[PDB]
C-alpha cells in the first residue's frame, strides 16, 4: 500500500517588457531564471523521484528573450557596469533594491550590512554592492561551482562579477532544454497556464464573485471578456506545443481559479486535468478529501491539492531547521498514509519560485534532503502528472458544482472588490472597447490587479507603470 506523491510546481513572470521602449523594467525574471526556472528541475538529474512543473507561456516568452541575449534589463544594466559608469538614477535603483532584499536569508552578507551603514559608496563599495546583489541569487547549480566566490563576500572586482554574469546567461540558455530532458525522460510532466495568467472564472462570469463573497462591490463590466478568455487557452496551447511539440493536457489554473463555467472551458479545450486549492473543494462538497481523483461531471479531471503541505513548504518550514522540517514533512505523509486503506494521492502544488529565498541557504539543504529523503522511502511513490492522470488503483469521486474561487481564501478579494482595484478594471474595461491587438490580453494578467491598492507593495509603481503601458498599446 503505498503513499501517492504529486510535487506541481507553478512558475511564472508577469510581462516586465515595457513595449514601447521595450526594457525590462524590473529584474524578476532574470533573478528567478538564474535561480530557480533551471535549478528546480534540475534536482532530478541528482535525484531519483518524479516532480512536475507548471510553466506560464509569458514566462516562456521572456526567458526565451533572455536567452537570445534580447532582454533590455535596466536593473541588471546598473549591476553590468563598471560603477564609474553609473547613473545617479542607478546607484539610487541598486541602494533600493539592496534595502528590499536586505532582511532575506540570501542575502546574508556582512558585507551587505556594511555596505548599508556606510553614507557614501566609493567605487569598490559599489562593485561590491552590485556583484553581493548578483551572488544573492545564485541558484543551486552555480552555488557548487562559483562556491570559493560567493564565500569571499567582499572585494569583487569587475572581471569576477561579468564571469558570473556569463555563468549565469549559460544557466538560462540551458533552461527550455531541461524541462525537455526531464519530460521526455519521465522525470516529470510540464503544463502550462491561459497565456498571460488571467482569472478566467471573471473574465467569463464577472458575476462568478458572489459565489463567496455577494457584498463586493465592483464595475460595470460593460464590455465581454469571454472570447480572449479562450484565447488565453488557446494561445497557451499554441506555445507549449512550438516549446515541447505537444499539445497540452494538462493546465494549472491561475491562482487555483475554477468555477463552474471555468472548467467547461478547459474540458471544451481539450484539457485532460487540472488541480485546484482544497478551500475550493470544501466549499463545493461536503465530503471534502483531498486524497482522491475528481472527475467534473465526467468531463475534465479534478485534484484538490492538499493545502496544509503545500502551505507549510510555501510558507513554514523557512522558519524550521532543514532536517527538522523534512522530519515534519515526511511523519505527516505517514499520518496520511495510515489514515486510510486506499492509497491517497497526495498533491503538494505551489509557486516553484518564491519561497526559497526565504529559506537558509535558497532552501538547498531543506530540497536536498526532503528529495534524498522521498528518493529512498519505500512506501512513497512519487509520480508525475500523467501518472497520477492515470493510475488505476486510487480512490475516485464525481462532483458535480464547483463554487467559483482561488487558492486564496476561495475567493477573489485579491484582485477585486476595493476601489483601488475596481479602477484597474474600470481601466480595462474602457480599453478592451478600444482595443485593436494582444496587448489587451497582456494587461488581463492578475499580477497587475494583485499589486493594486495594496500597502506598501514594493515597485507597485512599476507594476503601475507597466499595466498602464499595455493598456495604451492595446489600442493601437
Ligand atoms: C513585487 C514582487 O515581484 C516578483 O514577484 C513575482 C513572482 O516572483 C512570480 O512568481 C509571480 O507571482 C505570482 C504567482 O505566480 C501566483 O501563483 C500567485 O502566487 O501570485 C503571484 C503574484 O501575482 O509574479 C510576481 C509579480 O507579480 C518578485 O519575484 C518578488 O520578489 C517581489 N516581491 C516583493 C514584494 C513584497 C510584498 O508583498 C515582499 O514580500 C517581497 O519580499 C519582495 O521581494
Known amino acids: ?187 516529470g510532466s510540464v503544463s502550462t497556464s491561459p497565456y498571460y495568467h488571467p482569472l478566467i472564472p471573471i473574465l467569463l462570469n464577472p458575476n462568478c464573485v458572489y459565489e463567496t463573497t455577494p457584498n463586493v462591490k465592483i464595475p460595470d463590466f460593460a464590455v465581454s471578456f469571454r472570447e480572449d478568455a479562450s484565447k488565453h487557452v488557446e494561445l497557451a496551447k499554441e506555445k507549449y506545443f512550438e516549446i515541447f511539440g505537444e499539445h497540452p493536457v494538462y493546465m494549472w489554473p491561475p491562482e487555483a481559479s475554477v468555477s463552474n463555467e471555468a472548467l467547461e472551458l478547459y474540458y471544451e479545450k481539450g484539457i485532460n486535468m487540472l488541480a485546484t486549492d482544497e478551500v475550493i473543494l470544501k466549499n463545493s462538497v461536503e465530503r471534502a478529501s483531498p486524497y482522491l481523483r475528481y472527475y467534473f461531471r465526467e468531463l475534465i479531471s479534478v485534484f484538490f491539492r492538499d493545502k496544509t503541505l503545500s502551505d507549510l513548504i510555501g510558507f513554514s518550514y523557512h522558519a524550521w531547521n532543514a532536517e527538522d522540517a523534512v522530519r515534519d514533512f515526511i511523519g505527516r505523509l505517514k499520518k496520511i498514509h495510515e489514515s486510510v486503506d486506499f492509497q491517497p494521492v497526495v498533491f503538494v502544488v505551489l509557486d516553484g519560485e518564491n519561497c526559497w529565498e526565504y529559506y537558509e541557504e535558497n532552501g538547498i539543504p531543506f530540497l536536498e534532503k526532503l528529495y534524498s529523503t522521498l528518493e529512498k522511502e519505500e512506501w512513497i511513490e512519487t509520480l508525475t502528472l500523467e501518472e497520477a492522470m492515470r493510475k488505476e488503483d486510487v480512490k475516485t469521486e464525481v462532483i458535480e458544482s464547483v463554487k467559483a474561487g482561488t487558492w486564496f481564501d476561495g475567493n477573489f478579494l485579491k484582485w477585486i472588490g476595493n476601489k483601488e482595484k475596481n479602477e484597474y478594471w474600470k481601466i480595462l474595461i474602457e480599453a478592451k472597447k478600444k482595443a485593436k491587438n494582444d496587448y489587451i490580453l497582456v494587461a488581463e494578467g492578475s499580477d497587475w490587479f494583485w499589486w493594486q491598492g495594496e500597502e506598501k507593495a514594493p515597485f507597485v509603481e512599476v507594476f503601475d507603470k507597466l499595466f498602464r503601458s499595455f493598456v495604451r498599446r492595446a489600442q493601437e
Not at 7 to 36: C, I, N, S
Not at 116 to 130: A, G, S, T
Not at 137 to 145: A, E, M, P, S, V
Open 1 to 187: 500500500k503505498k503513499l501517492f506523491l504529486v510535487f506541481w510546481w507553478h512558475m511564472h513572470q508577469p510581462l516586465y517588457r515595457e513595449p514601447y521602449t521595450g526594457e525590462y523594467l524590473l529584474p524578476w525574471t532574470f533573478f528567478h531564471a538564474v535561480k530557480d526556472y533551471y535549478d528546480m528541475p534540475a534536482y532530478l538529474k541528482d535525484f531519483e523521484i518524479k516532480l512536475n512543473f507548471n510553466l506560464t507561456p509569458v514566462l516562456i516568452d521572456q526567458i526565451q528573450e533572455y536567452a537570445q541575449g534580447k532582454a533590455k534589463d535596466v536593473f541588471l544594466e546598473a549591476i553590468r557596469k563598471d560603477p564609474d559608469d553609473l547613473e545617479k538614477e542607478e546607484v539610487e535603483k541598486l541602494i533600493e533594491f539592496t534595502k528590499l532584499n536586505y532582511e532575506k536569508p540570501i542575502y546574508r552578507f556582512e558585507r551587505i550590512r556594511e555596505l548599508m551603514n556606510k553614507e557614501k559608496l566609493n567605487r569598490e563599495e559599489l562593485l561590491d554592492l552590485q556583484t553581493l546583489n548578483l551572488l544573492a541569487w545564485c541558484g543551486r547549480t552555480l552555488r557548487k561551482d562559483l562556491k570559493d566566490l560567493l564565500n569571499k563576500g567582499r572585494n569583487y572586482t569587475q572581471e569576477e562579477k561579468e564571469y558570473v554574469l556569463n555563468k549565469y546567461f549559460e544557466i538560462i540558455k540551458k533552461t527550455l532544454s531541461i524541462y525537455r530532458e526531464i519530460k521526455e525522460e519521465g522525470k
